[PDB]
Ligand binder design. Structure first.
Ligand code: ATP
Ligand code: KF6
Length: 327
């Protein structure tokens, strides 16, 4: 069967912390006062929650209230425990409170409010300098949560808020986040399609923190090449084909061979044969201002089939791409 895998970094974090740290079921939630928060307007609704802008009436400050749908308690406790563990970490969204919603009778997570810049606006106007600056801010959040034994598993543009005025970044939506435990087989149904790593697409369950570095690479490639999304699959199968047309099929076959993966036979008729395309093939007059040899070198080291061969967040921070960023 498949050969096991473990992260090359932060492998022991959850064993050397007490059991209370990662055993989210045993966690007893301290409940705040729901009347401290007055709902202002509905911001959105996902599959697991309804999101409201609100005012904390005890200090008159804006908050965001995420009222959870009554799906599965295990998921709820995991998100709370991860948010509390990472609280105060660099560029991690602050969980300000947990209350019982009077209407839904379900938990409602209260977060710090981010006056975020419109995402289409960020995509269309961040400069070469800003992409480097904000990518460095994302790496601070990722290295922190990975160092804390947690993988985000849903890194994508909508989960990375920026208040451009105050050059402030927050990594949000920790509902798919998980504790990394060596040898553990995880659900591959995580991350949005365009951001799914090859490990998920080939159904390799023993993945780790390095999944977040692939997703980050997808964000970077889209930004610098001006192609949204960069890997545009019609479904999860075609998603692997889109990747293969860029990275080639030979390295995909080596990856599968290395981990002794049994590739879904559905792939035999659609993968075809492709050779890696040099990154310069994606350069054109409309994206030349965001591309540099350092940007290409950095992207190359994130977008690798082999999850074990990708730069970690800490190594990524040492890359020449960030030398121009004021620290
Ligand atoms: N802490 C926060 N501060 C301000 N706005 C927030 C905060 N957390 C979430 N929001 C906003 O709440 C809205 C609704 O959240 P939701 O997750 O449903 O949206 P989304 O990111 O567009 O969804 P999807 O994950 O499908 O892309 C979004 O506009 C999101 O930016
Ligand atoms: C850091 C964080 C970000 N959040 C959302 C975006 C826009 C976006 C990225 C890819 C497609 N759209 C963004 C950009 C950078 Br660089």
């Amino acid at each position: 069967g498949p050969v096991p895998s473990r992260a090359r970094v932060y492998t022991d974090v959850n064993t050397h912390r007490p059991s209370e740290y990662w055993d989210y079921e045993s966690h007893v939630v301290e409940w705040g006062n729901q009347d401290d928060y007055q709902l202002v307007r509905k911001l959105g609704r996902g599959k697991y929650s309804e999101v409201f802008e609100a005012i904390n009436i005890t200090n008159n400050e804006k908050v965001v209230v995420k009222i959870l749908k009554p799906v599965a308690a295990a998921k709820i406790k995991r998100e709370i425990k991860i948010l509390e563990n990472l609280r105060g970490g660099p560029n991690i969204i602050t969980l300000a409170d947990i209350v019982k919603d009077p209407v839904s009778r379900t938990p409602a997570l209260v977060f710090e409010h981010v006056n975020n810049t419109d995402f289409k606006q960020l995509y269309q106007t961040l400069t070469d300098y800003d992409i480097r600056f904000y990518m460095y801010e994302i790496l601070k959040a990722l290295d922190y949560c990975h160092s804390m034994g947690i993988m985000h598993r849903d890194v994508k543009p909508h989960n990375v808020m920026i208040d451009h005025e105050h050059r402030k970044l927050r990594l949000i939506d920790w509902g798919l986040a998980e504790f990394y435990h060596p040898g553990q087989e995880y659900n591959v149904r995580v991350a949005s399609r365009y951001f799914k790593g090859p490990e998920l697409l080939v159904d390799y369950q023993m993945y780790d923190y390095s999944l977040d570095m692939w997703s980050l690479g997808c964000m970077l490639a889209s930004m610098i090449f001006r192609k949204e999304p960069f890997f545009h699959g019609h479904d999860n199968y075609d998603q692997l084909v889109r990747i293969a047309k860029v990275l080639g099929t030979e390295d995909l076959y080596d990856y599968i061979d290395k981990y002794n993966i049994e590739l879904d036979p559905r792939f035999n008729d659609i993968l075809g044969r492709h050779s890696r395309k040099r990154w310069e093939r994606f350069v054109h007059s409309e994206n030349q201002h965001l591309v540099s040899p350092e940007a290409l070198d950095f992207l190359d080291k994130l977008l690798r089939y082999d999850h074990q061969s990708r730069l970690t967040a800490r190594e990524a921070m040492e890359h020449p791409y960030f030398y121009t960023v004021v620290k």
